[PDB]
């Protein structure tokens, strides 16, 4: 009777952590939300007792679907099975089912933990060779960036996730994706020139496939073809400048740094 949610990373077979694989291997039962058939086959060859949670999808409200997923997972835990959930990337990043199952497990008094895994963001840093620490980093969900007030620091690397469904709502669907993206462009245009180079990124699933790293001017964003996984990278538009005030407090100067 325990629950452990693990991630498989983005790449097939290779990007799962040693311990996380060990968890899958010694589990009584494994619940999976994996991308493709190669992933599923890899998993089953690792532990033959698998339930594909993607059976609870519309073959319906996603909330309902998710409930059925959590219920299915907990059913095994309540049964006293050493249960492991195998999720894509990091089991805690953009992963409602995972969090719900853990919360609901801890609530019923079961042991449950989340093992960190490699996320798309992690693959992004490596693939592009960018250090978030270089000039800092901000990440927002695109729709949230449009719906709510989030003023970006244009010295950092800015990431807008789920760009594909940017500004999507029941009342905004009279608009086209291109239209909503055009609106996002104008929004970003506050801080970033229309010619500022941005990157559409998608981590690779298969080892014979490469990540999508498409470079284009901001203005062309609306014409781009986007996938559910697509992410928008917006590099700095302004270079760092010293905090001469704080520097003076420490009696130091740019040179000392």
């Amino acid at each position: 009777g325990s629950l452990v949610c693990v991630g498989t990373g983005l790449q097939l077979a290779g990007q799962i952590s040693v311990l996380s694989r060990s968890y899958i291997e010694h589990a009584d039962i494994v619940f999976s939300l994996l991308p493709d058939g190669f992933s599923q086959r890899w998993l089953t060859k690792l532990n033959p007792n698998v339930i594909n949670l993607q059976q609870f999808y519309a073959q319906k409200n996603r909330r309902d679907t998710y409930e059925q997923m959590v219920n299915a997972i907990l059913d095994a835990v309540r049964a006293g099975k050493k249960t492991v959930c195998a999720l894509y990337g990091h089991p805690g990043v953009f992963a409602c089912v995972s969090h719900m199952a853990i919360t609901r497990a801890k609530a019923e008094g079961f042991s449950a933990k989340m093992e960190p895994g490699i996320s798309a963001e992690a693959c992004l840093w490596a693939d592009l060779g960018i250090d978030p620490g270089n000039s800092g980093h901000q990440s927002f969900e695109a729709s949230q960036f449009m719906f709510f007030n989030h003023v970006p620091d244009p010295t950092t690397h800015l990431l807008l996730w789920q760009i594909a469904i940017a500004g999507e709502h029941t009342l905004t669907q009279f608009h086209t994706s291109s239209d909503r993206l055009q609106i996002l462009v104008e929004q970003l245009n506050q801080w970033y020139p229309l010619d500022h180079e941005v990157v559409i990124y998608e981590a690779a699933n298969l080892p014979i496939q490469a990540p999508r790293i498409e470079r284009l001017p901001l203005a062309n964003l609306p014409q781009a073809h986007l996938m559910p996984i697509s992410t928008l990278l917006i590099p700095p538009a302004k270079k760092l400048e010293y905090n001469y005030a704080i520097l003076a407090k420490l009696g130091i100067g740019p040179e000392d740094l």
């Binding site: 040693v18 311990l19 010694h26």
Partner: peptide, 13 residues
């Protein structure tokens, strides 16, 4: 202990 999930479990017991 850090790489073996079975040992990890056995340990917790």
């Amino acid at each position: 202990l850090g790489q073996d999930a079975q040992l990890m479990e056995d340990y917790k017991q």
